[PDB]
Structure formats: structure tokens, C-alpha cells
Amino acid sequence: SGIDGISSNESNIKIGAAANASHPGGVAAVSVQAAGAPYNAFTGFSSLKGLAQAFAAQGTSNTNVTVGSKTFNISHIPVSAMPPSHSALGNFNFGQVGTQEVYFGEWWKAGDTPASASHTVYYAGDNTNTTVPTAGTATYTVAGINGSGSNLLSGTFTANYGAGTLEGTLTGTGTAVSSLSLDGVAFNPGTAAFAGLATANGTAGIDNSGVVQGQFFGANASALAGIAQFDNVSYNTAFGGAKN
């Protein structure tokens, strides 16, 4: 019980819980494993939102973005906008699913781009209260991050709880990925973790090498989050969704 999540490269990014919290295990956090001490500590995403607000005049941003009926708080933290002593922490773009304890995002090393091998995607959320129905259907409004803090992928995912399948496609402009389609993404009915394959289209053409991993979160599966990794790392994407 507590924070669950996945990173596409644990040499660069690990997810966990913020230490010394009022809710041990309940505050989603991220560690830049690519950095040495003291830059590799686990920092709560909530604190990173605060930094993205605090450095806004220098080029970071924190914005409540509406996608249909849902709000996704987006934090954009490029190395170029942060003081030199923060260069080892690298570049972040991440989102929060509403006010739920569910975060999803990406990272890459200082001096790299999202096309570089260090492009890493992750999600993190509190599993403590998660339950998933064993029957019926629901839809989610989903936002995706792919190499940008200003242009998001968006779409609707459909959860078939009786069949144990998650289906749908995200689309967007201004990112390497133009469309991302779940292929056989599935879960045991009544359980939270899902995985499968994916196909992206975009500025490099079709890439069907995608592997998707994620999970439902919250009472009655009020949210979901996950990652999609491809042979072409510029297509690596993190996503989060709120149940409609």
C-alpha cells in the first residue's frame, strides 16, 4: 500500500514516496537517479509544482489545462529556466490528474532533447484506496506528455471492466507523436495494473514497437496513469486520465 509507479529507465528516474510525510507512503515523489548526491533525493511532485510556479519569470510554468471536462495541472521545468546549480536535476514536464494523487511525466538530461536516449517517462500515484469494478464499462478523459510542456496529447480511453481491456487513441499537435493507440492493453478484471502494446504515428512515421504499462488509481478507478515506450525514444509518452 502506498505510492505505485513505473519509470522507463531507473538509471535516470525512480519513483517513490516523499519521506518524513504527514501521510507516509501517500505523497508521490521522483528521484533523479542520473544525478549524484545531493541531487538524487526523492522530491515530491507537489514541491516540483511549487518550483515550476516560483521560476515562472525565468521560463518554467505551472498551468491548469482543461481537457474537455477535466483539469490537468502541467508543470514545465526546462534546465535553461533554472539556476545553474539545478542543472544536474535535468528537464521535467509532468502532469497531475486533477487534484488526485496521480502524476505522469517525462525527464531528460541537461544538454539532451526528448529525442536523446535519456528521455525517460514515468507515472506515480497513491494506490491505497484503489478499487476496480469487475463488470461494466467506463470512459476516461486522458492527457499525454510527449516532449513538451505546452502541447499535450489528448483522447478518451474506454475501460471494459468485465473483459479486462483498455482501448483508445490519444492525438495531438506540436509533439513528435501525432497519435498513440493502445494495442491489446489488458488487466485481470477487478485489478488495477494493466499492460499491453501500442502503435504511435508522428514525425518519424508509424512505430508499432510500443509497450504500455500503467494502472488504475483511486476508489472505483477514478483515475489511471501509465507510460508507453518505443524503440524510438522520441515517441516515449506518459499519460494520465480521469474517469468521466
Residue numbers in the entry: 21 to 264
Which sentences from the paper describe this structure?
Here, we show that A. baumannii Slam secretes HphA, which functions as a hemophore that acquires heme from hemoglobin and albumin. HphA is composed of a C-terminal 8-stranded β-barrel packed against an N-terminal clamp-like structure through 6 intermediate β-strands. Once secreted, HphA has the dual capacity of binding hemoglobin and scavenging heme. HphA along with its cognate receptor, HphR, function together as a two-component receptor required for full virulence and facilitating extrapulmonary dissemination and/or survival in the blood.
To examine the heme-binding potential of HphA, acid-acetone extraction was used to strip the co-purifying heme. The resulting apo protein is devoid of heme and refolds to its native conformation as indicated by the absence of a Soret signature in the UV–Vis spectra and X-ray crystal structures. All apo HphA chains adopt an open conformation and do not show structural heterogeneity in the heme-binding region. Comparison of holo and apo structures reveals that the loop containing H43 undergoes a large conformational change upon heme binding and release, while the 310 helix containing H106 is only slightly displaced. Apo HphA interacts specifically with hemoglobin conjugated to agarose beads as evidenced by pull-down. The visible spectrum of unbound apo-HphA after separation from holo hemoglobin beads confirmed the presence of a Soret signature indicative of heme piracy. This mode of binding is plausible as the loop containing H43 is flexible and could wedge itself into the heme-binding site, positioning HphA to capture spontaneously released heme using H106 in a relatively quick step. The loop containing H43 then dissociates from Hb and clamps down on heme in a relatively slower binding step.
